[PDB]
Design a protein. Sequence first.
Lengths: 430, 430
Amino acid sequence: LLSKQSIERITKILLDELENVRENEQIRNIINSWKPLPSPEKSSIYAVDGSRSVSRLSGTVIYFLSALAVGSGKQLRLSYANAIKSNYGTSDQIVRMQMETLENMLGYLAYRKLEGEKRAILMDGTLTGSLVRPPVYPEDIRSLNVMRALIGESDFENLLNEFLEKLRDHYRKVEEHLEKNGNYDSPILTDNVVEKLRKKYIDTKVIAVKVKIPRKALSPRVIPIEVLESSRGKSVDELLQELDEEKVELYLGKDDIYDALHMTLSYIEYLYSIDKLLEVKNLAYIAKSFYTKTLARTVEIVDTALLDAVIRTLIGHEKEGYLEIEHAVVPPKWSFPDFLLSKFRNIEKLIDKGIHLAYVRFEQGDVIYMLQSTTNIEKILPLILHHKAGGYLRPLQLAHHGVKISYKEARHTLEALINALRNRDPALKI
Amino acid sequence: LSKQSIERITKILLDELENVRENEQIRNIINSWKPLPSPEKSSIYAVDGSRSVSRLSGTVIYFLSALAVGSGKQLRLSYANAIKSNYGTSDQIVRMQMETLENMLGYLAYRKLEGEKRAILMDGTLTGSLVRPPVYPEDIRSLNVMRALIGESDFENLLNEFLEKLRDHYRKVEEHLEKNGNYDSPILTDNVVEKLRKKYIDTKVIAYGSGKVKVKIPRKSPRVIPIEVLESSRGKSVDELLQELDEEKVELYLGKDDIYDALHMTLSYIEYLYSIDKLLEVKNLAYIAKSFYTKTLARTLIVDTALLDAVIRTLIGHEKEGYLEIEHAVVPPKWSFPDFLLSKFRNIEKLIDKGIHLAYVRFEQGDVIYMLQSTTNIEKILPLILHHKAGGYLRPLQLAHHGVKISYKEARHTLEALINALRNRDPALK
C-alpha cells in the first residue's frame, strides 16, 4: 500500500540524521585518521555466539538457551532449558543475562582449550552494551540491596563468598564435561543451588517481612519545592545528603524474598562470567549495530551505519580499512555495586583502564562493523584477520550459521512431552 | 533434549499447579462456576492489531495495523513510521501507538454501529495496561520534566492545545473511514511535535555548547523542580537557591535531543490517554484474553486461566463451558495516571471511581478458558458477546485475528528498496 505521505516523513527522519550528523564540526576530523587494515599474522581462535527461544504459556515463560563456539578446536556447546514466572520486562531480562552468562563461561572455557602461540576469543556483540545498562537494571541492584539489608552485611559477605566457591567448583565441572562430551546441559549454577542457600541464609532468619533500604536502591528526577522551602536555613549539601541518606521500609512475601535471592545469585553468577572471560588476553567483540544513546552520555561516538554513509558520500571511498577511536571508554561505577567489585578484579581492571573501540570494514564494498577489545586494536586486529575467508571471517560465520536456531528444538517437542507427562492444559495456552 | 531438564521444568509447572490445587481461596469460588447466560441479540465490532518492527542500525522501522470486523463493514487503521533506538523506550512507544490505533478504531467502530444493543470486543485486558502501562517509569518522568522546564501555565497551554488538535484529528479520521473505511495517518503526535516543539520549547531555550541548551526555570498548581537544580548548586544555601528560583536566576543545561524526546513522549502519552478515554465512552465494552497473568497482576489484590483450567478438570473434572465471575471489581492504582492529567479525561476518571469487572469464561465444552474484563457487570455484557459465539469461540474476534495475521512483509522492499531512492543505500543492509 503506497502511502506517498509517510515515506518522505520516514526519509526525512533518516536523512535528517545523516545530512545533519555531519555535526557542523565535520565528523570532528577523525575521518582522515582512517587506516588500512593491517597484516594478517597467525592465531588460534574461537568465535562464540548464542541463540534463544522463548515461549509464553500464560504466566510462565519456557525458554531454551544455546551457546556455541566454533574455531580451531572441536565444537563446544552450552545449553539450558528452563521456565520462569512472567514479568513483562524483568522476565526477558533474566533470560538475556543467562544467555550472556552462557557465552562468557563459554568464550573463557574455549580459550582455555585453545592451543597455539596466539590465542584469541571472538564475541558477537559489544562489551560496553552490557556494561552501561545491566539487563534487569533496576532489579539486580534492588534485589542485592534488599538482601544485604535482610540478612545483614556480614552474613551477606559469607553468602557471596560461599557462592563464588560454588562457582569455582562449577566451572571446573563444566570444563570436564566439555572435554569428555563437547556439550553441557546444566551451565547455570543458580537454579540448582538457590534452594539450599535459601534454607540456610534465609529460612532460619525470617518469620511467617519488613526491611529498610536506601532510597537509591531502585531516581525521581524532580522534587517538590516544598522540600526546599522546608529546608530553609540549611545548605543544598545538607539537603542532598538527607535525600541520599533517605531510607525506606518494604514488606516482603516468601515470594519476594525468594525472588530477591535468585536475582542476587543470578547477578553474581553473571558478573562472575564477565570477570572470567576478561582473562582472555586477546578478546574481541564484533557487532553491526549498538545503542549510542548512553555511550556519548557517560565520549562522542556515532553509529556504524551513519559512519559508512558519511564514508562513501563525503569522502568517496567505499573501501576496506578501519578507523581506531582515539579514546578508550571507562565503564560506569553506578552499574557495578561498591562491595562486589573487590571480588572480580578484571571488572576492576576494566573500570581502571578501559575498553578499546574501533570501526572496521573487512572488505571492499562490504559493510562496517564495530569492534571492541580489552587491549589495543593495533595488536588484536591482525589475529582476527588471519581467519578472514569471505565477506567476513570464517570462525564468526560458523557461529552464526551453527547456533542459527533450528526449527525450535522445544517447539511442539519439549512441549509435547510436557503434553504427555501430566497436563496438556498449560500447553494449550500458547 | 534432556530428561532431568524436562523433569525439572515439569516439576516447576506441577508445583505451580499443586499450589493452586491446594485450594486456599479457590475451594469456594470454583464451586461458584456457573452456566453461560442465555444470549442477547447485539451488533458488535471486535478490534485487534498487529505490528512489524525492523531495526536498521540505531533506527526502528515499524508498521501498525488495527482491524475491526463485525456487524458493520470492515474498518482499518495503518501507520508506518521510523523512530530512533532507545533500548526500553523504542519498543515501548511502538506498543503505545499500537494500543492507540486499537483504541480509536474501537471508539470509531462503535459510532458506525447500528443496533439496539451495541458492543465492542477488544483483544486484550483493561488491567494489563493499568497495572503496568506502556508508560513507567519513563513517560511520567518525561511529564514531570516537561512540566518543570516549560512550567505549569505554559504546560496547561500545550496540553489544552494538543487536546484540541486531537478532537479535530478524530473527526478527520472518522470521515476517511466513512468513505474508504481505512485511514493511513491515525497517529497525530509525530506530525504535530516539531510545531509544538518550536512554539513551546525553542521559545524558552538558548543554545549551548554541544547538543545542549540553557534553560531557565520558570515560576508559579503543584510546583515541581528538576532534581538537577539541587545537584548543580552545592556551594549555596537553600535560601540562596529559593531566592535565585524566584528571581528566575537558575539555569539548567540539558541535551537538546533529550528535551525533544521528553516532548515527544509527552504527546504520545497524552494521545494514548485520549484514546483510552474515548474508548471508555463505549457502553458495552469487553476485553478477551486467553492469557494475561503477570505475578504483579495477582499480588496487587486471582489465578491464571491456564492454572484454573488445569485445576478444574483436576479437582472437579468438569471441563464444562460456563463462567466464574470474580466477585469484587478491580480499581487501578492511581500511580498509573498523574493527577493533573485525569481532569482532562473524565471516562478514565470514572474508571478509577467505579472499577473493572472480571470473569473467567469458557465459551465451549473442551475449549480453553478466557479472561473477560468489562466496564459493566459480566451478567450484563456476557450475553451480548454470546450472541456471536461460533466455535469454542466468538466469530468476530476469530475474524479479527485471522484478518490481522494477514499482515504481509513487503516491509523490506517497501522502504528498503524505495529508501535507497532519495540518498543512502547503506542503512538498508544493516
